[PDB]
Design a protein around this ligand. Structure first.
Ligand SMILES: C[C@H]1O[C@@H](Oc2ccccc2[N+](=O)[O-])[C@H](O)[C@@H](O)[C@H]1O
Ligand SMILES: C[C@H]1O[C@@H](Oc2ccccc2[N+](=O)[O-])[C@H](O)[C@@H](O)[C@H]1O
Lengths: 328, 330
DNA sequence: TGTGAGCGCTCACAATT
DNA sequence: AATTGTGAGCGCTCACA
């Protein structure tokens, strides 16, 4: 049985409360008293049983996070910025990873997070409107913030402005004089993917352009490669491609190149994310920058505000920007 | 105040213990009684406060994980396979991410994980031998498994066989007839990086070869690009490069290509990891495969065995393999 | 500074029938 | 002999003293 707060009480000549104050950096200590207590716990290697502290009522803002597999780029980047910002605010973070596809899986995840009595949830998992509303409802009394829902979902959410991203992309290709444009989208089961797809159609339409092709990948470079290969093998050869993410763009670029065409000069390409690696593709990839650090930082700040009944309900849009490189 | 075990007690006509039995799938229930209780908690949307269950003494296997930033490839892949395998074993997982560089930071992380009374720790953070031994010592009574230490560290650990990876790389370049070989290593502050560096030197030496260059990156493709550019600008132009990871290899390939040289035909390249993207680099990257799923899966199984006083102490080496692609062709 | 109380549950028994 | 209750406590935080 690990050292208790009681064990330090006698090994310091004080009570369990005296030690408590010391541990909590409380106000009103016997000055030199704290010096003695700390030495007492130091020699016994005392580590406050957080499990007991929480139950006892210690107000510790504990953020829960239901997320897509961390094996995926953006999710990992986001959780990272979340834990980082939470540590910086003295907030704790427990995360439930959802691997199985489906709303039940996400609900299971929210269930456990709730069991750990989190003071708020951050759901970074693709959810259709009613499913999101359902999840939001299951969050018994605790606030929920969503990161993978449409801007049209009636719940608290933060997402990058797909409107701005897709416009930037389309307008860039247009200003370069492209008219034969193909679209490589993320998996349709992804809300974010769908939002980008919609964004492209919206702005391509406003420029009286109709994509000469439209395929669906799964976020992986291999899918980008295969999809762009099938497209080219069907004789459909555009002069520019808008791709849902940098990784698929990479695969597209491989297919283009292994076909005898020059990325840029023959078929321009635009990616999405502006991942670290994108600046070193052959040739450097023009892309839309999504500052994941900012999303994770903002997510935590926001979930805390909500937890404090602060009037900041709704949907928030994060800025993005065009990074001009050599693929266009 | 969320629904208590007490709330179900009267909303079912039983006591808190009766409900407890039903919740824990206990032995000796009133048969139909459990049928009633379950219905009672179902209608009240009851979710057992795990915090209270743990304190009360409920024996649950909770794995703690101190790790390098999840913003890095391998660590994120590893934590994912860890959480995945733990969920599959009905084990819970809490993870403390260490961002600040240093042993104190890692100790801080272990401190918190201990505060949550985990039944074991998985440290995936670069630790020199004495620092690792120190951390291991701080793990008051609970078993610790390390993933970023040397195979020579006297503690429980699991790492990929750098010996096999570097040999595979070196022997491959040699069989292709390369003699002018440059080395691009990961950051020296990384144990894993150093192990690979050592491995290359070891096997290059056994083939009577001396690298004509040896630079250090930081795992990022940009570092791979910059380092390989400085190297080429100094007039040092090898015929093959061994790179500590696929991302730096990417940067190297960019530098090689933007220099008028053909990756493969003029300067061969070998990476490390066999990341998903590596199969789609221009041209496809020959690399050393490190099965991160396997590492995370094995780590959990192993930490649990240790937790059960199973005699499996020491260091374990995981296999790796060479993935031949196009960067070492012609 | 001490004291009382409790957080939600698990134990260990006891207590029902 | 089945089933239920009862007592106690887990480690700490509160509220007071
Ligand atoms: C920043 C956005 O990134 C999307 O990121 C995704 C998700 C998985 C793999 C790659 C990408 N991507 O963009 O390249 C998320 O689905 C969305 O919920 C939001 O987190
Ligand atoms: C599988 C191995 O990967 C190494 O991975 C690293 C670590 C950070 C960024 C990239 C890589 N990498 O290999 O490309 C770890 O340092 C080592 O502890 C172990 O986890």
């Amino acid at each position: 049985k690990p050292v208790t707060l009681y064990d330090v009480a006698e090994y310091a000549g004080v009570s369990y409360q005296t030690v408590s104050r010391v541990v909590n950096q409380a106000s009103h200590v016997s000055a030199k008293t704290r010096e003695k207590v700390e030495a007492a716990m130091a020699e016994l290697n005392y580590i406050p049983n957080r499990v007991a502290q929480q139950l006892a009522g210690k107000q510790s803002l504990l953020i829960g996070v239901a997320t897509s597999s961390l094996a995926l780029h953006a999710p990992s980047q986001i959780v990272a910025a979340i834990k980082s910002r939470a540590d910086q605010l003295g907030a704790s973070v427990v995360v439930s990873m959802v691997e199985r596809s489906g709303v039940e899986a996400c609900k299971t995840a929210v269930h456990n997070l709730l069991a750990q009595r989190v003071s708020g949830l951050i759901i970074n998992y693709p959810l259709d409107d009613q499913d999101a509303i359902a999840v939001e409802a299951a969050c018994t009394n605790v606030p929920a913030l969503f990161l993978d829902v449409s801007d049209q979902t009636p719940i608290n959410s933060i997402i990058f402005s797909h409107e701005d991203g897709t416009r930037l992309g389309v307008e860039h290709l247009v200003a370069l004089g492209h008219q034969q444009i193909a679209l490589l989208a993320g998996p349709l089961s992804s809300v974010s993917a769908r939002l980008r797809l919609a964004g492209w159609h919206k702005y391509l339409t406003r420029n009286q352009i109709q994509p000469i092709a439209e395929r669906e990948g799964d976020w992986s470079a291999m899918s980008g490669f295969q999809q762009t290969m099938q497209m080219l093998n069907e004789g459909i050869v555009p002069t520019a491609m808008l791709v849902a993410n940098d990784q698929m763009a990479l695969g597209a670029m491989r297919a283009i190149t292994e076909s005898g065409l020059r990325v840029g000069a023959d078929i321009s390409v635009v990616g999405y994310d502006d991942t670290e690696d994108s600046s070193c593709y052959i040739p450097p990839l023009t892309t839309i920058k999504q500052d994941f650090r900012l999303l994770g930082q903002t997510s935590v700040d926001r979930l805390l505000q909500l937890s404090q009944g602060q009037a900041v309900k709704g949907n928030q849009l994060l800025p993005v920007s065009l990074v001009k490189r050599k693929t266009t």
